[PDB]
Amino acid sequence: ENYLIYSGFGTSLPQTYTIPANGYLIISITNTSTGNIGQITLTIGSTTMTFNLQTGENKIPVIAGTQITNMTLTSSSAILIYEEV
């Protein structure tokens, strides 16, 4: 089951998001190129994590209540964020 978190466009996120369950966070970044495309930052409790993003699917194990606090892309893209639970 795939829970939609965000769908949009550009190079960053308009708000922070809460991941609702344990599972895999999927960040699908699509654009007319391939390869490295930016960064995402997640926070859970007292831990902050920073991850490299590539085009296509980026999969990150996450626990319930993890926050997506920032994403920064190097070129405008379609951005789809959902969680496999």
Instruction: Return the exposure string of 13-24: e unless at least 16 CB atoms fall within 10 Å of the residue's CB, then b.
Output: beeebebeeebe
Structural domain count of the chain: 1
Angle at 26 between CA 53 and CA 31, to 5 degrees: 50
Paired strand residues for 81: 6, 27
Structural domain including 62 reads 1-85
Measured in whole angstroms, the distance separating CA 18 from the mean position of its chain's CA atoms is: 11
Residue 76: CATH number of its domain: 2.60.120.1300
Alpha carbon distance 29, 45 (integer Å): 26
How determined? X-ray
